[PDB]
RNA sequence: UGCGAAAGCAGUUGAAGACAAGUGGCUUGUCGUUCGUUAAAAUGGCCUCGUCAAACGGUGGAGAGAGUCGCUAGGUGAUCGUCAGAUCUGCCUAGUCUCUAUACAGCGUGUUUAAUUGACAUGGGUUGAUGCGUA
């Protein structure tokens, strides 16, 4: 793993608190500096740096990097063939880009690459390059409509062009715009045929010598990816169903691969004989982030050889120029053929003007094996961060999550949302709470279902088993604002405490006799006001519970489960009305407890029963987080302090799309800010793993942490026998 | 860190016994005992005794006399047992053992030769430790723990006469260096305000804490980590907490220096020589809910104002999320000075109090969130306007709009202005449900009935409404049913509450049939408008016409 | 199975429960049938419990429950609650029995300390019967 | 890529009185046989060793039945008066029977013609005869002489021990199952006496005061014994002389007990009890002798037994009634050239280095609605719902899968009069249940939303809508009156 | 779109430019165009890798089914009849009564708290649907 931020060699290329458009745009396998000698890769970035890096053994502490003499252009990609090298570049009327192709040379002065400028294309809509990189097709928009042009780049072997109205049918001109919008194109290694995949769902192989077309109709929603095999007789296609089809182009015969946990936004054959398929799966059940899974797979038995994925959190809001991909209709998982430009303008305006800029998530840590559990939409990604690779992925609700690739209308259905999950403190059970949503346009379309599930695994198996589920805990249609696992003194850490927005509480516990997790204790008040500013805390002794409802922190006992009482009235203060609705009641240890509400941050001792410290939060966290998310923004320890965490959206010379994070720690009842750290990007969740560290989740999901004769014969034989 | 604070020899018995505590006496002959009756014979008495114990038999009793040895007594039968002298200097604190648990021939002068609980059984001579001024016996693995004023700590185990550990403990003149409640530590009190817990397995301090106030007769209770302490010239025996299955409530320990405070149980009246009165009757230390009662040994409150995250180049604050301001200029000195600016000769006017408060807190005069305030400050300015001066139009409007008003709200029915009263119904954020139910059932037959039923429903739990609305007469509830039947949703569920809380049988019939007819037609109209809300091809021969 | 293949959802033999089972914390009257009912409830005799509560004359039910001993009205009510939970057409005839048990023994089961915990099955049955009332209101509208 | 998730059958929250594992196991004892005897069946014992035959003591004959045909294999009829007790020895080799003339006669089992020895016990009727359970050559007979006797079957002239001491009508023996010197006897004055046989034997070492006259005493552990008599049974720890459970869940007197251990069951131990009012009940000794299942019979049940712990075949529960009949409920249980050509097909990789396994497991067969939902034939899935032989939860789960999954309207588009009548005719039945009625509500609402003109045309679904209206009227009266009961006990908190 | 509670409470829906069609304009409609506002459809659907049979262990059940015109409570019909009421031994429903392989449903038995074994050469060829009636 060649870490960029590990060294100034190429973290000097990008470590900026504002500028991440410096991107890595191509990797080549050879050495562009010296030919004919390869175990090291040359990476071209999107600005013009060319870094040569050894990935065999330790990375060299001074790579062979250069910087090519480039204009304002921004490096679309590079291209290789036998010997020679091309590069392609993008430009500055109607918002279209403009492409320009150069050729490279290196040899005379070994610092610069000299360029040559073959040709230009002055308006480009869509582009693709063949598998060998020997030719490339693109679209034009030159008038009544667009146009399609193919050109060989490493030779003037062929360059043709035609208006695509001669591709399109006569039926499509009296039909919807999806029938003539094109979302994919591909060419084979000879330039004889070309695949145009349309947003209506069809594919059309044109034969480039005579412009005769052949229609392939299987995709019932938009075609998102096309590729040819090397001989050109098989076409891989992928779309909004999560099914990779491969079309035998002789008999037009599909072979499918149907449940690929993400829509195929790119697919291509990979090997010399074509023994691997590489795919990019967009995993669009969460609309708040574009989270791609990289999956190659061997073509023999179609098994996922080396699937690759980062951590998959679901933030409360959309993040940073995130556009859910194109489709046929404008849904809650996609957007139609018209609304991409308006949606990106609206999303930029929402990040600029608006006020509720909270995109924070809940992540949990399994207290047995220290891997963290990102609850995806209707599923969890179990992921360990000492090697940053996914343990597994598991569906925890009963939707149409896995059984079906949903398409044009059906994308307006959502699978149930996992909103809470907490482990019991010995890591033996996982409590999860989900909101099951009904489909629209029927009688029960406006009453949700609330399901609380209890899962178990032993310490070997990677996936959990449902032991029980309670549909509608706390009553029908009432949510669960907060679940809290219980300490090791109530039922040997096998109890949970769920809270309503009525202020009702239910204590559930697992008893072995009736071998199930059943409802032990109940305290329901029947108010007529509701608020989801509910928090909960427990004494480590297992004696008294701090029920932080809105504006009011009640103190209940555990034996009779009502409000605390001593008959002697030894100033038994069992309620703390504060200036605003409270969103954290985090008790650091059995002496005192930190309350956080939307104006101030108080701390209250109980061996000296009054307020000890207070802090000002309103200039920082005003109306920007939803009420109930400060609990995931701040956290604690079990000995060594408490962690607050604020966010400053940066400014120009109006706010911008850029952020910075100010995390601060306190020891021992808000005494000293002994940690004042600033991170270059928005921070979304922070939480204490159980061995005195605090992990946090960056908005671009980097998990960070705040912590405390014979010799020459041997050499030549290992050469000559390898 | 205290406990429930009140009350201003065999060590495991109680009452219903005869005398399982026979102890020595100050300024008397040697010793005595009493009942709630066992005989008081002699254990070869008339010496310089300072305490007295037994072999946990009460007929093998003794008088622990300062003569280097002790003999047995006959306090039940009449047959004595033989003895054997070891030393001849001072055995005033002799403690006879059980069946081979913890015994050695240590009298007073560094001669702790190990022996057994017998008159002729011997062991090694474990007199190796120096001159110890605090020698105690514990049950780690039954052990003599010596703390020496040659200052050094040592711990020998009288199970195989084996010196377990020892170090240099610099202990000064103590008050009570008593072993711990689970025996794992040594609670040694410093003279006036301190009690340090030291590790009594390694001779090192583990937690040196201060105490609350003056206390002299301190000893660990039969608790987890709790001690009892009586005042020096006081009968006040308080309890503090720094056995775990079904703990003790009385008869825990008898070491006190009060007005003859012998044999200290919870009800400690009938003493062994004293015949005194009794006190508190609680148990030992619980887990963590009694420390909300005994919240002592810390009384250091100041005026806590809201601080700010420290300005280390705060000019790069990056688009603050307020409306127009950035930070309120805090003036706590002006907050205190507004009291002097208000407590003046504006005895009936709002020219030097209301303008003063609204100048010190530049708000819209009915709104929160431009806070910088203290509850003691708001309580004292509310006291200064509850004095010589509700005729202010800004101060007592903007501060029932404050979530810290603190229970000076009881006269809100006792003063009756319409707009201030309705504003104190809606917005005053702590209200007594006694006064709320009185205002509810003292009906003026208006929309403030709806405004008071709203708050009584939306901030109190239904059973806490029911138990404290049992406290009503019957004319109130009969006129309430009559006014509901005469002439809405929250009062329907309030009617449900009054029917649940009047009780079962003691009703009348005509009011019940009137309410039955009224709610029958109420369910009929509710059903019909619920229905309203849930309610919101070619023949074979035609004949038609066309244009001519 | 593949390493990238997600785990499907499977309930298996998980116990699905609701949020409302609170199972954890001279003559001159008639010729009634209450000796039959009493020594149906002292044992667990479903057969002669069925032959005693297929009697559906209102005065017979009334003074039968009046002559019943109040220490076992709670278990008569438990048997009625479980039978109307299982068989849904019994709710018509059998809830005549359950309203008379509450009216007559209105003191015993208000002096019992845990009413909901002792007759949980009645509370869960009536909650699931009356919870869907807005839905079939909209249906019949 | 994954495999396709199976369609999960819609399970609701569980209703009260579910089927426990204990009552599922004890409910598969069925196919009752009723055999009319000449008189009341007083005792029934089982063969211990090949635990597959049982002896029923009627009046003046003892019949051994087989546990595979349930007919009388053999019968013992040469008694002069009413035979009372008949038990097998612990080796199962011979059979003792106490008779109303006080003549214990022991035959060998499976040979009624060879009476092996006739112990002439007391002149009073001998009411209980059983061999030792540890020892083989001693036989304990108690009689209506208020004295039990231990007989060595070699010296069958004088009893080798005479256990007296009881004041009235000793009717039961028992032996303690680890200490073989320990005989617990039970009489009609209460007072389970029990005797150490190395001592004098004319005095018990202690006595257990069951207050009612006991009918039976059995031994469960080596420590605890259970005595039934009167309306209850009590259990007694024997090392501490002390009662620790009592269950009185009957109407009349518990006549008999017996006990099972280690047999193939969810219940690891089981005590069943027979009680003169028709009932035989099974109690589980591990959770505090709580009752788990019961049978009701057509008269007062006088004696009962089950198959012993090692039955290995057809397993039996037998109960003999005082009416004079016997009720049995059982639970049951190409060429050499071609083979030389196809030899290897049973090898399974023993001496082989690497052993590869990728044969996938064959899952359960898909039903037609599940494969139609898989094939996206949504209207065909609705049609496959409304066949007659479908379970109610299966119709509910395919309705719920079409509701959550796609479109009710897609499933209902191409319909008319003849193809909607299955749906509405099921919705009549589904509107009654709580678990179905939400789905029935929205399906009926959608079908009247998009078939309001077929309502006008066809009169033969107008009447179906009217019947549905009266159904929802009955159900809304029920859902209103349930809320009234809910309020009227909310008043009583 | 904003505030919210899951109910609800306030706000809407402009402009420019280009192109297409229709009759240089005029009308209408679009936009891989911009600025401002907090703001339905191209006949087009999801892979093979082994099935079948018989058990067993937990989990649910509205039980899957068949009788007795046996009881309890009902809803209702044909013809005659002034009604009274007659015949249809009137029909249907629910509960009860009686019986069965718990018949029903689902998950699992590769290791699991628990619980599985067995058949078959898992091919090729010819008819097999125009050869069939019990209706």
From Swiss-Prot, chain A:
Localization: Nucleus, Nucleolus
GO terms for biological process, alphabetical: maturation of SSU-rRNA; maturation of SSU-rRNA from tricistronic rRNA transcript (SSU-rRNA, 5.8S rRNA, LSU-rRNA); positive regulation of rRNA processing; positive regulation of transcription by RNA polymerase I
UniProt cross-references to Pfam families, sorted A to Z: WD40 (PF00400)
GO-annotated molecular function: mRNA binding; RNA binding; U3 snoRNA binding
Keyword annotations: Nucleus, Repeat, Ribonucleoprotein, Ribosome biogenesis, rRNA processing, Transcription, WD repeat
Transmembrane feature ranges: none
Gene3D superfamilies: YVTN repeat-like/Quinoprotein amine dehydrogenase (2.130.10.10)
Residue windows of the WD repeats: 218-257, 413-465, 475-518, 528-568
Any single GO CC term annotated in Swiss-Prot or TrEMBL for this entry: nucleolus
Main location: nucleus
Subunit structure comment from the entry: Interacts with snoRNA U3. Interacts with MPP10. Component of the ribosomal small subunit (SSU) processome composed of at least 40 protein subunits and snoRNA U3. In the absence of snoRNA3, forms a complex with other t-UTPs. This complex can associate with pre-18S ribosomal RNAs.
Function: Involved in nucleolar processing of pre-18S ribosomal RNA. Required for optimal pre-ribosomal RNA transcription by RNA polymerase I together with a subset of U3 proteins required for transcription (t-UTPs).
Note from the entry: Present with 6560 molecules/cell in log phase SD medium.
Protein name (database record): NET1-associated nuclear protein 1
Annotated gene: NAN1
Swiss-Prot record, chain B:
Subunit structure: Interacts with snoRNA U3. Interacts with MPP10 and UTP25. Component of the ribosomal small subunit (SSU) processome composed of at least 40 protein subunits and snoRNA U3. In the absence of snoRNA3, forms a complex with other t-UTPs. This complex can associate with pre-18S ribosomal RNAs.
Recorded coiled-coil stretches: none
Protein name (record): U3 small nucleolar RNA-associated protein 8
Gene source species: Saccharomyces cerevisiae (strain ATCC 204508 / S288c)
Single GO MF descriptor: tRNA binding
Record's GO cellular component terms: 90S preribosome; nucleolus; rDNA heterochromatin; small-subunit processome; t-UTP complex
Gene responsible for this protein: UTP8
Keywords for the protein's UniProt record, in alphabetical order: Nucleus, Phosphoprotein, Ribonucleoprotein, Ribosome biogenesis, rRNA processing, Transcription
InterPro entries, alphabetized: Utp8_b-prop, Utp8_C
UniProtKB/Swiss-Prot annotation, chain C:
Function: Involved in nucleolar processing of pre-18S ribosomal RNA. Required for optimal pre-ribosomal RNA transcription by RNA polymerase I together with a subset of U3 proteins required for transcription (t-UTPs).
Range covered out of full length: 348 to 545 of 643
Family affiliation: Belongs to the UTP5 family.
Subunit structure: Interacts with snoRNA U3. Interacts with MPP10. Component of the ribosomal small subunit (SSU) processome composed of at least 40 protein subunits and snoRNA U3. In the absence of snoRNA3, forms a complex with other t-UTPs. This complex can associate with pre-18S ribosomal RNAs.
Protein's name according to its UniProt entry: U3 small nucleolar RNA-associated protein 5
WD repeat ranges, renumbered to this chain: 67-107
Note: Present with 33100 molecules/cell in log phase SD medium.
Localization of this protein: Nucleus, Nucleolus
UniProtKB/Swiss-Prot annotation, chain D:
Signal peptide segment: none
One GO term describing the cellular component: 90S preribosome
Highest taxon in the source lineage: Eukaryota
Per-repeat ranges for WD: 36-77, 78-117, 123-161, 165-205, 209-246, 249-293
Keywords: Nucleus, Repeat, Ribonucleoprotein, Ribosome biogenesis, rRNA processing, Transcription, WD repeat
InterPro entries, alphabetized: U3_snoRNA-assocProt_15_C, WD40/YVTN_repeat-like_dom_sf, WD40_repeat_CS, WD40_repeat_dom_sf, WD40_rpt
Single GO MF descriptor: U3 snoRNA binding
One Pfam family from the record: UTP15_C
PROSITE patterns: WD_REPEATS_1, WD_REPEATS_2, WD_REPEATS_REGION
GO biological process terms, semicolon-separated: maturation of SSU-rRNA; maturation of SSU-rRNA from tricistronic rRNA transcript (SSU-rRNA, 5.8S rRNA, LSU-rRNA); positive regulation of transcription by RNA polymerase I; rRNA processing
Listed SMART domains: WD40
Protein's cellular compartments: Nucleus, Nucleolus
Assembly with partners or alone: Interacts with snoRNA U3. Interacts with MPP10. Component of the ribosomal small subunit (SSU) processome composed of at least 40 protein subunits and snoRNA U3. In the absence of snoRNA3, forms a complex with other t-UTPs. This complex can associate with pre-18S ribosomal RNAs.
Note: Present with 358 molecules/cell in log phase SD medium.
Protein purpose: Involved in nucleolar processing of pre-18S ribosomal RNA. Required for optimal pre-ribosomal RNA transcription by RNA polymerase I together with a subset of U3 proteins required for transcription (t-UTPs).
Protein name: U3 small nucleolar RNA-associated protein 15
Organism annotation: Saccharomyces cerevisiae (strain ATCC 204508 / S288c)
